[PDB]
Symmetry: C2
Subunit: 202 residues, 2 copies
């Protein structure tokens, strides 16, 4: 004759994420962090050299979200007038994805004095060329890079240490949406990839 109290709905169906105000977050400076590749030519030469040695490049990137006036903003690292990146980078062979992303974000943003429970997408680079796709194209059996994106939940407050040559910016979703010319195909589709989340604006 008993009834059961119903379980919290699956996190697959409704995923809630706490956001905090932009003003909860601050940065201090650290020494500059220079890009591994000094040009487009060097980038693709290194990708080719490493592909021959260790196979497909495995990149991981973190999407950290804050709000201002109840609108989500994604944290980006500005390196040039039109050059923005997510905090992340290249995994070492054998390295766990999530543990690697933790290492990489400590390297880039780690204060000098991470909660990663959510995969938000995957992108693949079929050739030693710029184009990347959110799927493996037909008959591509050996992509040259696989990029995996994760949502990194921030604490209520945090201090970041930012390499001097980077500017830590908070981009509102309307800045990113349908703005591949400004931010590229991955960052510009973050609004779509974040749309399923139930955000709490603390």
């Amino acid at each position: 004759g008993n009834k059961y109290i119903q379980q919290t709905k699956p996190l697959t169906l409704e995923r809630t994420i706490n956001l905090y105000p932009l003003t909860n977050y601050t940065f201090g400076t650290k020494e500059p962090l220079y890009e591994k590749d000094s040009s487009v030519a060097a980038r693709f030469q290194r990708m080719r050299e490493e592909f021959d040695k260790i196979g497909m490049r495995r990149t991981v990137e973190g999407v950290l979200i804050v709000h201002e006036h109840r609108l989500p903003h994604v944290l980006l690292l500005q390196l040039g007038t039109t050059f923005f990146k997510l905090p992340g980078g290249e995994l070492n062979p054998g390295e766990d994805e999530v543990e690697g992303l933790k290492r990489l974000m400590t390297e880039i943003l780690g204060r000098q004095d991470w909660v990663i429970d959510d995969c938000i997408g995957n992108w693949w680079r079929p050739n030693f060329e710029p184009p990347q796709y959110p799927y493996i194209p037909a008959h591509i059996t050996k992509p040259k890079e696989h990029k995996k994106l994760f949502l990194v939940q921030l604490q209520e407050k945090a201090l970041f240490a930012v390499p001097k040559n980077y500017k830590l910016v908070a981009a509102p979703l309307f800045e990113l949406y349908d703005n591949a010319p400004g931010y590229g195909p991955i960052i510009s589709s973050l609004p779509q990839l974040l749309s399923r989340f139930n955000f709490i604006y603390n």
Copy 2:
């Protein structure tokens, strides 16, 4: 001194979905199902009339995935040369989202002789106009429509009953990706929204 066997990784982090070959699926015909709105003018007039009476329109849509040669395809309903839609429609006031989507897909596709565990995105229409966004734009406190998308897991085999005036097609991700001119902003970003899933190609 004991060690614990580790739990399956969270479904938030790695979400696996079984797909089956296109040839596992068939359709039979039923009577035609006419669009509620006969023109763009009538569409926005009805949206306005109903907004005044019952508030924001609540639409729900199902994303059903199959594969051919290990490439995902999304099922769409073709109504015209350039007019494709997802199976779904408008919720009744008070109606549960998932139960409403089940009702709507039975209406459209239900054989005459649903597993919905995943939210994949949200879109909002700020005005009585075509544009829709994957977020609520700043200072929009009363959007006119909220569209919610769900992944509908298919059984190994299924038979569909399709209104005579619709053609059931299976669209590969490369047909959709960066093809808003062909399919609109929602269907064209399905490849990005599906990229997080670990698909098993049965």
